[PDB]
Amino acid sequence: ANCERTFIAIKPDGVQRGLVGEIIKRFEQKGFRLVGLKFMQASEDLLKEHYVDLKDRPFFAGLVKYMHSGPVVAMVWEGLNVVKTGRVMLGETNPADSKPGTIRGDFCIQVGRNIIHGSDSVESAEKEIGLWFHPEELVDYTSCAQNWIYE
Amino acid sequence: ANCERTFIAIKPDGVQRGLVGEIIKRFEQKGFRLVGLKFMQASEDLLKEHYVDLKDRPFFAGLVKYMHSGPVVAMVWEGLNVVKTGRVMLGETNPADSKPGTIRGDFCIQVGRNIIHGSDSVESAEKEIGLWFHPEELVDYTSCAQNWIYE
Amino acid sequence: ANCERTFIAIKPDGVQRGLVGEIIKRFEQKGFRLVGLKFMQASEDLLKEHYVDLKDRPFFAGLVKYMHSGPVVAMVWEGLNVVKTGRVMLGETNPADSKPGTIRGDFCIQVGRNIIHGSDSVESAEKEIGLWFHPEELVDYTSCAQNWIYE
Amino acid sequence: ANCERTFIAIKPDGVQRGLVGEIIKRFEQKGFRLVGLKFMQASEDLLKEHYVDLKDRPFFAGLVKYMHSGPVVAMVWEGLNVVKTGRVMLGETNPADSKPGTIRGDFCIQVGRNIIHGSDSVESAEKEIGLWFHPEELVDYTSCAQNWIYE
Amino acid sequence: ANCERTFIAIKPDGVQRGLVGEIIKRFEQKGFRLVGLKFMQASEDLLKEHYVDLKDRPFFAGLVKYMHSGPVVAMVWEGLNVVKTGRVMLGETNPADSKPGTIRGDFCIQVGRNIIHGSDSVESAEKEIGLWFHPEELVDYTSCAQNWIYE
Amino acid sequence: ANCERTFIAIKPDGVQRGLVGEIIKRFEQKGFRLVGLKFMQASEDLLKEHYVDLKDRPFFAGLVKYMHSGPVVAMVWEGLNVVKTGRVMLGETNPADSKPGTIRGDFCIQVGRNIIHGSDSVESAEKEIGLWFHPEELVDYTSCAQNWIYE
Ligand SMILES: Nc1ncnc2c1ncn2[C@@H]1O[C@H](COP(=O)(O)OP(=O)(O)O)[C@@H](O)[C@H]1O
Ligand SMILES: Nc1ncnc2c1ncn2[C@@H]1O[C@H](COP(=O)(O)OP(=O)(O)O)[C@@H](O)[C@H]1O
Ligand SMILES: Nc1ncnc2c1ncn2[C@@H]1O[C@H](COP(=O)(O)OP(=O)(O)O)[C@@H](O)[C@H]1O
Ligand SMILES: Nc1ncnc2c1ncn2[C@@H]1O[C@H](COP(=O)(O)OP(=O)(O)O)[C@@H](O)[C@H]1O
Ligand SMILES: Nc1ncnc2c1ncn2[C@@H]1O[C@H](COP(=O)(O)OP(=O)(O)O)[C@@H](O)[C@H]1O
Ligand SMILES: Nc1ncnc2c1ncn2[C@@H]1O[C@H](COP(=O)(O)OP(=O)(O)O)[C@@H](O)[C@H]1O
Fold this sequence. Notes:
6 copies of one chain form a homohexamer.
Chain A: E1 5-10, H1 12-16, H2 20-30, E2 33-40, H3 44-50, H4 60-68, E3 72-78, H5 82-90, H6 103-107, E4 116-118, H7 122-132, H8 146-149
Antiparallel strand pairs in A: 1-3, 1-4, 2-3
The site of one adenosine-5'-diphosphate has 9 residues of chain C, from loops.
GO molecular function, one term (chains A, B, C, D, E, F): 3'-5' exonuclease activity
Pfam families (chains A, B, C, D, E, F): NDK
Keywords (chains A, B, C, D, E, F): ATP-binding, Cytoplasm, Differentiation, Endocytosis, Isopeptide bond, Kinase, Magnesium, Metal-binding, Neurogenesis, Nucleotide metabolism, Nucleotide-binding, Nucleus, Phosphoprotein, Transferase, Ubl conjugation
């Protein structure tokens, strides 16, 4: 098995374009366990604290704005190397550099409207999870298919 | 347009059988607007109240127990006639009576494992939404395709 | 076999909501032949003759305006009962009476934004076919699968 | 649970048009258990003995021919009311009368090239199963999801 | 944003093997705009100017014959890097070097039956675009999702 | 064309997680020809011989046991470079190293539960086909789209 968690957020462009279910499907079909799921308009404070290590950049202002401009689906997924694998499923930050088959590769175009975020490290993951979710919103259960997903 | 809402819950079998994404995708692609989304283990109290109109039924205690046995995905969806046509999308209560193309017709077999719940009326819907969600959890936004979904 | 034809048009909500590829796909996988396919910004004059049998109706005016308000995907499909069965595939004129499985029942909500036009009759189809398409534009070929599609 | 079995055969037109996996997917996603699966060119004798209760009809000659003209996928599926439900999933014999959402409804056109067969009764089922399969080709195992499919 | 254009053609194997709806779908869901769309039985003269840079090559003769041997779906797609990224989406010229996820990598096998043409450059695209399409036939409109597709 | 064949088996996790249809569908849609298909519980003897080149590996006994723990779908697929490009479709041995768009990249997580086997060479392929199938079980037919898949 493995209880490694990651934080995946669907951005407002992802919501606005009706990509929520498709994105969730990709994680389910892969065998990752859904741990947390909420739908929220994320506050400026939250998005600032979240994207904080990128305050120095000339897209940060417009970033926080856009991320506050609509609703986001906040998710926590569990499984073996979710963080790393999840990021591969996502694709490269820039959808022009994301390979076909990937989420960004398949469904979006420009880096500022790249539909989705996912943690870049297990460090980022736990910070992002504590920041977007309350402990009691992370649900624990066992997949019926656990023994067929994991040795 | 219409601001009518319905309550849709994905039952623990739905979550266990990896249908969250699929189900959300059908509501999205139909043009309906996601208003609330949460992942939780429902308390028996909650469930008993949820299903209070059925307290006098042979299946009630089983229903409550089964509904408490795993996590559910609680959702709120908005649109013209969402309640009535949301139920059409779900199929009949019994998956044997649900037609191919409906969520239950396509994805499940037995009545006690019918994967999804939908409000049966506007009155029920609002009772159910108030019971499962706080109004601040319900997100207001306008679909970018609104004018293309509604005259 | 049968080389009967029908006019199917994907209205501008269809195009705007990105249902072009999906709608074609459903006719293809049914095993109908793509006879002609044009992406046209239609005209009011063009629309009126098409909708002449509805000039008597209140909505007519705005329909023409809506039908005129953005690009359409204009198409001809060849096959046995492509007229009649294609209308079963469209679902009812009102998306709220359209069954899940049908194109409207899956992808839209309101009678006035019902994403797709089909031909009510072969009578209407021939009338319709010639108005949007000249014989030059219509294509003729044999489906490599024809023998497996019809005895 | 329930161990009711049915016999589903994909006809050569269904194989030739690449519909095998899609058909199997429909049964899997529904929750039915795959019991038997073989791929075969079916003998005239077998097809005659199989379609025997229809020897009196003016399509029987051309039927047996066509059914022998290519390979068939022979399947056995298990579950609650599989025979009856399987036939609903299939659709009406004539694809012009099969509803969208159904296998025939979605993927074929003419009754002589209607892609698929499935037993019309539990009587037919067991006869067809003994006739197409050897006992040792019917595999017994338990779905990991059995308790989520069945009460 | 970006209103750059590219020529994408679905070769006659693509059309014969029923991949029209699926290919469009993949460009749509990527969030590119359908500029123009014609189903043409192409000409040898037409094909030669297109394939002029390959007149020096052995296969050229038969390519033109194959390209000429059945209907094509001729299309223009508008978007940011629709030329370049569209070629990543096509996969390599040889389907055997095309990655799974790409259109060729998923749907075809042999270099000489590679189902789809895309533009090697914007240089080539403009050259290509004008040859198959006149300005009348090209459509102009704004995607209701444009704001969510590009910052 | 090409009459090269490969052996593909769906491992018991593949069958348990409802991926039979999905997997077959990818081989079909790619243009490859299904030659043999059988559903069976593999004997340890069979499996030990199947995997004889790996008898000296730390994982061998586990592999055999796991492979014996449920039914597998044994298949034979034909086409130009099926062996090599069949493996490209599967992903890397380790699903963590398999790219999105591949069967393992999309559908599984751990190396010991990597859902599918494909022959690693022509020599292996023929050894494997001879081991799992009798030549009379392998069905010869011509795809109706052959001329459209192969020059
Ligand atoms: N040059 C840019 N212009 C606009 N937005 C950007 C740019 N670079 C990054 N972003 C946005 O900021 C977010 C965070 O950036 P980064 O951490 O580099 O990528 P990722 O989100 O893939 O970890 C990205 O999701 C992206 O949408
Ligand atoms: N006969 C039954 N046996 C077991 N469970 C049942 C039975 N009837 C209904 N249920 C469960 O109770 C839920 C609520 O029942 P009801 O309100 O009658 O149907 P609906 O869900 O269509 O509103 C159903 O979705 C189903 O899961
Ligand atoms: N009550 C209505 N209100 C608004 N628009 C309507 C109404 N009825 C029909 N329409 C529009 O007019 C078009 C043609 O109407 P009609 O010919 O009766 O239906 P159909 O398109 O099913 O043949 C429909 O596709 C629809 O967009
Ligand atoms: N009028 C007809 N013309 C050609 N083929 C037919 C006709 N009627 C039935 N068939 C074929 O014979 C098979 C058996 O017929 P029947 O038992 O009536 O339908 P089903 O297969 O739905 O049980 C059908 O699958 C169908 O393909
Ligand atoms: N070696 C080859 N043998 C046969 N046909 C080829 C070969 N190389 C290319 N072609 C055909 O010629 C077309 C154009 O070739 P080229 O312009 O090099 O590739 P692309 O279409 O990727 O730009 C291809 O789409 C393909 O159908
Ligand atoms: N390190 C491992 N731990 C557990 N199982 C393994 C390991 N490596 C390989 N296997 C299993 O053995 C099978 C055969 O191994 P190998 O031939 O090396 O890979 P491939 O399947 O790519 O040919 C794999 O498909 C996998 O299921």
